[PDB]
């Protein structure tokens, strides 16, 4: 995360770290959506242009974390993966359309002060909140700059951007399964996701029921925190029928 700040303790208890077993390193962010299911970006697991194609045994999920690098004894919980599910129409070839994947854990994770699921939006919450200018919150342990790495989880609040502005900022083809967020050059304030933040959540706190909802997944951007560029996020609600189908079938 570029131009964010250190998270407060327990600020993002749905935050998940996708951790490579060997070599031991950060792979991506992710989020906890129930005691057995974790949501992330498909490109965290499958991205052939970079020779990425992980299997379950390659990976761990680390839940309840704050420190990036420390083993947070008695706080974090480490889970093995039972199964990965990638959206069947995930477009790794072109533009990361439908950049979403689910991971089922081998065993349920115990909730705690540091570990708690985020809500997924309903159609109405999505309609109400996914509006230009409305701010969400992005969290992760990714790089602090495009060209270093944080001690603890970082957080940044960013406004959703008008779709034509998103479109006009890039040559990449944008789809309805994406939205973009970030400040405009004339807005002064800054901030973006960056490498290593992929797969983490873009959340919004509903002013109707005071619950946090995950509206987006950190997906793609051209550089990090560049003027006139924006970060692109998977539109979770648009893909929720797939999420539900997977959980209903395999839960």
């Amino acid at each position: 995360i570029v131009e964010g700040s250190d998270a407060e303790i327990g600020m993002s208890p749905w935050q998940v770290m996708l951790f490579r077993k060997s070599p031991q390193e950060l792979l991506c962010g992710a989020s906890l959506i129930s005691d057995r299911w974790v949501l992330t970006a498909a490109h965290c697991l499958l991205y052939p242009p970079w020779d990425k194609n992980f299997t379950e045994n390659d990976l761990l999920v680390r839940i309840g974390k704050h420190s990036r690098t420390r083993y947070e004894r008695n706080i974090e919980k480490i889970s093995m993966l039972e199964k990965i599910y990638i959206h069947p129409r995930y477009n790794w070839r072109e533009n990361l359309d439908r950049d979403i994947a689910l991971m089922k854990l081998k065993k349920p994770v115990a909730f705690s002060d540091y570990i708690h699921p985020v809500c997924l939006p309903d159609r109405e919450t999505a309609a109400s909140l996914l509006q230009a200018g409305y701010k969400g919150r992005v969290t992760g342990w990714g790089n602090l700059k495009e060209t270093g790495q944080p001690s603890v989880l970082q957080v940044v609040n960013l406004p959703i951007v008008e779709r034509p502005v998103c479109k006009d900022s890039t040559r990449i083809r944008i789809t309805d399964n994406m939205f973009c967020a970030g400040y405009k050059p004339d807005e002064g304030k800054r901030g973006d996701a960056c490498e290593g933040d992929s797969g983490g959540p873009f959340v919004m706190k509903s002013p109707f029921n005071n619950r946090w909802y995950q509206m987006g997944i950190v997906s793609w951007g051209e550089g990090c925190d560049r003027d006139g560029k924006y970060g692109f996020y998977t539109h979770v609600f648009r893909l929720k029928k797939w999420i539900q189908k997977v959980i209903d079938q395999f839960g």
Partner: peptide
């Protein structure tokens, strides 16, 4: 989950985090 999206250290204790108000103020 019936309890999703409510943080033990914040909403469950009626404590706010340092920047959630910035979100609320944007929800015009």
């Amino acid at each position: 989950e019936a309890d999703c999206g409510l943080r033990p250290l914040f909403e469950k204790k009626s404590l706010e985090d340092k920047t959630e108000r910035e979100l609320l103020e944007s929800y015009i």
